[PDB]
Paper text:
The significant difference between the catalytic cavities of PECPS and CUS is principally attributed to the steric volumes and placements of Asn199, Thr213, and Pro267 in PECPS, which form a constricting loop to cut off auxiliary pocket B from the overhead main catalytic pocket. We also constructed Asn199 mutants in which Asn was substituted with Leu199 and Phe199 to investigate the role of Asn199 in enzyme activity. Interestingly, the activities of N199L and N199F decreased by 35% and 56%, respectively, compared with that of wild type PECPS. ITC analyses indicated that the N199L mutant possessed a binding affinity of a KD value of 120.40 ± 10.78 μM with respect to 4-hydroxyphenylpropionyl-CoA, which was 6.5 times weaker than that of wild type PECPS (18.57 ± 1.37 μM). Remarkably, the crystal structures of N199L and N199F did not indicate critical movement of the architectures around the active site, and further docking calculations for wild type PECPS complexed with 4-hydroxyphenylpropionyl-CoA predicted that the side chain of Asn199 could be essential for ligand binding via hydrogen-bond interactions, suggesting that the relatively reduced activity of the N199L and N199F mutants was due to the hydrophobicity or bulkiness caused by the substitutions of Asn199 to Leu and Phe. These observations suggested that PECPS utilizes only the main catalytic pocket to generate the final products.
In this work, we demonstrated that PECs in agarwood are biosynthesized from a common precursor featuring a C6–C5–C6 skeleton produced by a diarylpentanoid-producing polyketide synthase, hereafter named 2-(2-phenylethyl)chromone precursor synthase (PECPS). The last remaining candidate gene encodes a PKS (PECPS) sharing high amino acid sequence identity with the other four PKSs, as well as the highest 93% similarity with AsCHS1, and this gene maintains the Cys-His-Asn catalytic triad conserved in all known type III PKSs. The crystal structure of PECPS showed typical homodimeric type III PKS folding. Crystal structure analyses suggested that PECPS utilizes unique one-pot catalytic machinery that includes the release of a diketide-CoA intermediate, which has never been reported in other known type III PKSs.
Author numbering:
A (entry chain A), B (entry chain A): 7 to 391
Amino acid sequence: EWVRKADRAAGPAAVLAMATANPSNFYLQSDFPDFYFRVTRSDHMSDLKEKFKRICKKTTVRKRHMILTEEILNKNPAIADYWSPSLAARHDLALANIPQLGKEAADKAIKEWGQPKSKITHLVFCTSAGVLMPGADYQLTMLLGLNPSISRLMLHNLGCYAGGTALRVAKDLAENNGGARVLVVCSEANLLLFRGPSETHIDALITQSLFADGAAALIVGSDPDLQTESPLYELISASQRILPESEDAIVGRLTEAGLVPYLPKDIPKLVSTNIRSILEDALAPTGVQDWNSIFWIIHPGMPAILDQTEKLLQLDKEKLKATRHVLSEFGNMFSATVLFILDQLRKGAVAEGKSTTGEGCEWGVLFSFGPGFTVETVLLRSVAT
Amino acid sequence: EWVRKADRAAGPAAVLAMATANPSNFYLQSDFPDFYFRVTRSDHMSDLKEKFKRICKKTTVRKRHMILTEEILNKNPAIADYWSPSLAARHDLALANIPQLGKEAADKAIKEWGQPKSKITHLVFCTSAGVLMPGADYQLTMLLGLNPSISRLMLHNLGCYAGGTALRVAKDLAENNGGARVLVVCSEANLLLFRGPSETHIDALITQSLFADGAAALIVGSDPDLQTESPLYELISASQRILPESEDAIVGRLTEAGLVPYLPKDIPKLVSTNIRSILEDALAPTGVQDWNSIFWIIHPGMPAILDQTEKLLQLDKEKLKATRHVLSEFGNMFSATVLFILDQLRKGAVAEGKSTTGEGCEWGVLFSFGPGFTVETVLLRSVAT
């Protein structure tokens, strides 16, 4: 059967451009335990400091960009405490930083795209760094001078899987509207999660060792004008799933003192149980049986999950190379991390000179996760260089 | 030109079912000034009490359903104060009430729809009553036993226009995925906005006179199986717009003490300036020139906007009848209000026995608004009874 094309697009949604951005201020992981326990007026917790040093080393992270400088933490002491009233201050910082960080990634992705920004018809904006009314989607539209009639989808506090959610949303936006060009932006920061240590809570210390700040921006569109636009990936399928027996695995309570996490269940064992059949379902219409015949993007929120998954699928160590790079160089930047990894993968493919944007392979899987327990899964097709 | 139907849907998204729900506990508007100033330990502000009485009367509201009982306000005194740390308590109440309220509307819309809930493939969930991780979208999926692989879009704290946003999102979900059935749920409550009075702030007293609690649920799908499903409306176009010269018209700061509004600009004059050309743009592909040849749903967040708009377009008073009913009987239920009004309009058409679900008229416009200043506009086509 056939249908009249009408106002709709012919082909699959394509990633047409991608860039990233980070705050200027970063911290090397090897200096962070000293910086963290100094500025949170907490050097006295000497045994906890030792525990944190051990955790920070095992995160295999090297640096993390962070809006929060010593000076800003000085001008907002409540944020540095473990649990003091501080939501308005965190959100004042989100308003001064999150749309601006998004605009820096967006400007670079639009520059690569090479088209006028009045051709952008949709914005998808994800952040867990501050609930704003009007949203960071609004602030970015103003800072960028986008059409006032852009169709915006503002996604607050989905958590870490929202990079997948952004692609899943952009897919239906682009395919159902002919000509539609979708700016996708995930702009993340620890502004809600950052706090001092307490011996009573260690599910808060692990969070201080990993989360960092960054924004990714993409252009997503179908029916590319192949003489002005160069597709980078195709978004072929995009699905969401609640994993069985995962109730309250990841919970985030937003309080007077900001965002407070609670991690009772074994996240690795949950992923390890379920990842294979999820990915088998994603790969089903490709006829790919070899796990190392596809490129890989896994949200790196827990390093152990990468290792255990690498082992289970007996992946070549080179597969998770883009993923492990972003982890080491940037940390967990919430929903943005998987889009950084997509970008590093595209860049490492062109640098090392391989046949496809997907490292020579044809198909690829994007796998992200967070509260639910929720998994987002995207099936990607590379393009030839 | 034509395209292969493939995995996509042939025709426009249709509203196939709708129901509403409210908390059991309600308050008549004529008793509210006494109840409000009593339970907020505030009877001493006698002049403010008089001012509130005047505001409450001019809201033309008759009753409002509210989760917040005297007893619950007794068990959470910080919520009753003007500005005390209370976010965690408000959010504990959101978790116990907002997904459940959504489930009551959903159960009734699914019952009308007449299909098994395993046919539901997408959930769009809007709320400004509490940021939850995982979201009310998750909690509802569990309470309803929906497929764990449903595609969910959780929209926190868009504010009052999100009933339009929900329809705009559901439209592209249904049209781009053949067979897709989209549960749409807006579940709203004043849990973040409720607070005591202060003489220093009157842009907070007006908010206490209008906002109320309620949930609406719809089934949205394209390609209806016309022997098991009876379409109610078609979603023909859906657009969003930032109005010019509207920077900071409506701002909502989420703080330690909950959601605090700020309303510096003249909202009526902004709508009055712009509504005509927006609606003319929506109606453009219909060839309708008569304003009273179409049915009407206007978000009733400010009663004066209804009157001034009724006058400007010289509308027959009968046009905004469904809209004014919901206002009087339920108040401003945030994003849910325009879906209540859609439902009351459908019900008033079948009750008074008219030719179309749109009161005999063929086309209709849905107009909602909130922070930005943002306007959502949906073009609806009725169906014959």
